[PDB]
Write a protein that binds this ligand. Structure first.
Ligand SMILES: *[C@@H]1O[C@H](CO)[C@@H](O[C@@H]2O[C@H](CO)[C@@H](O[C@@H]3O[C@H](CO)[C@@H](O)[C@H](O[C@H]4O[C@H](CO)[C@@H](O)[C@H](O)[C@@H]4O)[C@@H]3O)[C@H](O)[C@H]2NC(C)=O)[C@H](O)[C@H]1NC(C)=O
Ligand SMILES: [Ca+2]
Ligand code: NA
Length: 419
């Protein structure tokens, strides 16, 4: 596999502050293709200046030809909290509505939706008046809505959308799922699905495929990031209502962090493994986790694979030239092509200040990590567009540059693959 073309666009000037608010590992999602268009969301500085930001949403046509980006500015909600948790997630349901949830660290939900199904009935002009106001609840559902952190969306097969998040705090919290019906426009509460025990689960993502929902996590004892332990897994056949472990054993509802039956790899505290890194269900139904640790004696990214025969394996991702990350370094992602043969590691490198794109293949049991491409000049937790890669074989990555304000830009990089 090779690259046919590399293209990039600058979509904004990143915001100033001592935290990164754009390009954060748990944005789910920042960059989405739906129908014939690609969408992106990010903060930009408002006219009041430093510590005042607005959410922006971009769109461009990508099929059957690629058109120019255009942006709207949601100038009715001012983001002011310089806390690296306070990112934006976007989702697009099968009625065409665009959902946003943003700006949380242990506070009530902030959510808004488009008035109309603007990703389905595509409007000529792209303006902020396409969005309804910020609200602090999910119409049709019920709380708790606070203290919330980490909103994550997952589109289901019938057009519906899940929204998942933590209620509680680092070191003591639970997670909940809500489901939006594209047919009725109402939310419903699926309830608490994982319950902490003087700790909290930190999931890596949500991955839905062919009727099954997959997640993986580590458990955090305290607000100190050295107190993560374990790599855990579960899946659901009913979009989050009921859950099973890797051996198909039904779990209690909610899943307790104290239930060791979901553990797939023992990783002690102090292993330099970070929470909320990456996961992937590939199109063949193999599940993958990206984490890191120091347990070999060197810091390395780690690939966990749930193999078709059921066994889990763990392999370091150590292609030539990749500098392995420590606990606080930017987090990566795993992407997959349509065929399920190609696994992409989208791995920020802390020494190079760049994002590496590496590929491994299912034929070689994913052991054949090779450098495929690079995005230079990043200080980001890279995020990609699943649907665009499946539909057109283009790996599209949203990144925050490295460098100083106001030189540091937000970009989208497209790698057209010779798939
Ligand atoms: C429910 O699922 C869990 C989680 O997957 C599963 O537990 C895992 O079982 C496997 C298989 O027994 C364990 O892996 C082995 O552990 C022993 C040590 O106790 C090792 O000796 C093994 O390594 C040898 O065998 C490997 C075979 O490929 C060789 O490759 C290797 O080089 C060694 O010769 C092997 O690693 C694994 O530790 C657990 N995991 C956890 C987290 O407990 C459990 O069995 C499932 N239960 C049911 C009833 O299905
Ligand atoms: Ca997802
Ligand atoms: Na705790």
């Amino acid at each position: 596999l090779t690259v046919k073309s590399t293209k990039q666009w600058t979509i904004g000037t990143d915001v100033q502050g001592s935290e990164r608010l754009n390009g954060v590992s748990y944005q789910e999602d920042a960059l989405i293709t739906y129908g014939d268009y690609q969408y992106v969301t990010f903060y930009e500085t408002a006219p009041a200046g430093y510590l005042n930001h607005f959410v922006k949403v971009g769109r461009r046509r990508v099929s059957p030809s690629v058109g120019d980006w255009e942006f709207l500015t949601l100038d009715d909600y001012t983001q002011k909290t310089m806390d690296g948790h306070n990112m934006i997630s976007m989702g697009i349901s099968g009625d065409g509505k665009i959902h946003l949830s943003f700006d949380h660290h242990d506070v009530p939900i902030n959510y808004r939706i488009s008035k109309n199904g603007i990703a389905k009935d595509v409007p000529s002009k792209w303006t902020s008046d396409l969005f309804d106001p910020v609200v602090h609840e999910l119409v049709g559902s019920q709380g708790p809505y606070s203290p919330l952190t980490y909103p994550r969306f997952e589109p289901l097969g019938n057009g519906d959308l899940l929204l998942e998040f933590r209620i509680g705090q680092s070191g003591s919290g639970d997670s909940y799922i809500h489901r939006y019906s594209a047919s009725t426009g109402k939310w419903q509460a699926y309830g608490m699905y994982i319950q902490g025990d003087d700790n909290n689960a930190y999931i890596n993502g949500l991955d839905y495929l062919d009727g099954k929902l997959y997640t993986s996590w580590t458990v955090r004892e305290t607000p100190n990031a050295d107190t993560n332990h374990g790599v855990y897994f579960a899946y659901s056949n009913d979009d989050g209502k009921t859950w099973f472990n890797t051996n198909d054993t039904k779990l209690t509802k909610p899943i307790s962090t104290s239930d060791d039956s979901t553990l797939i790899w023992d990783i002690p505290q102090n292993s330099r493994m970070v929470n909320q890194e990456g996961q992937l269900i590939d199109t063949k139904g193999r599940f993958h986790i990206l984490m890191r640790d120091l347990l070999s004696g060197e810091h390395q990214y780690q690939h966990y694979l749930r193999k078709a025969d059921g066994t889990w394996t763990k392999n370091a991702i150590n292609p030539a030239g990749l500098n392995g990350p420590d606990l606080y370094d930017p987090r990566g992602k795993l992407a997959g092509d349509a065929s399920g043969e190609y696994l992409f590691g989208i791995l920020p490198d802390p020494v190079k200040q760049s994002t590496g794109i590496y590929v491994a293949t299912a034929s070689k049991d994913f052991k054949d990590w090779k450098s495929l491409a690079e995005i230079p000049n990043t200080s980001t937790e890279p995020l990609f567009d699943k649907t665009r890669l499946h539909e057109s074989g283009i790996l599209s990555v949203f990144v925050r540059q490295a460098g100083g304000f106001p030189d540091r830009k937000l970009q989208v990089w497209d790698f057209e693959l010779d798939l």
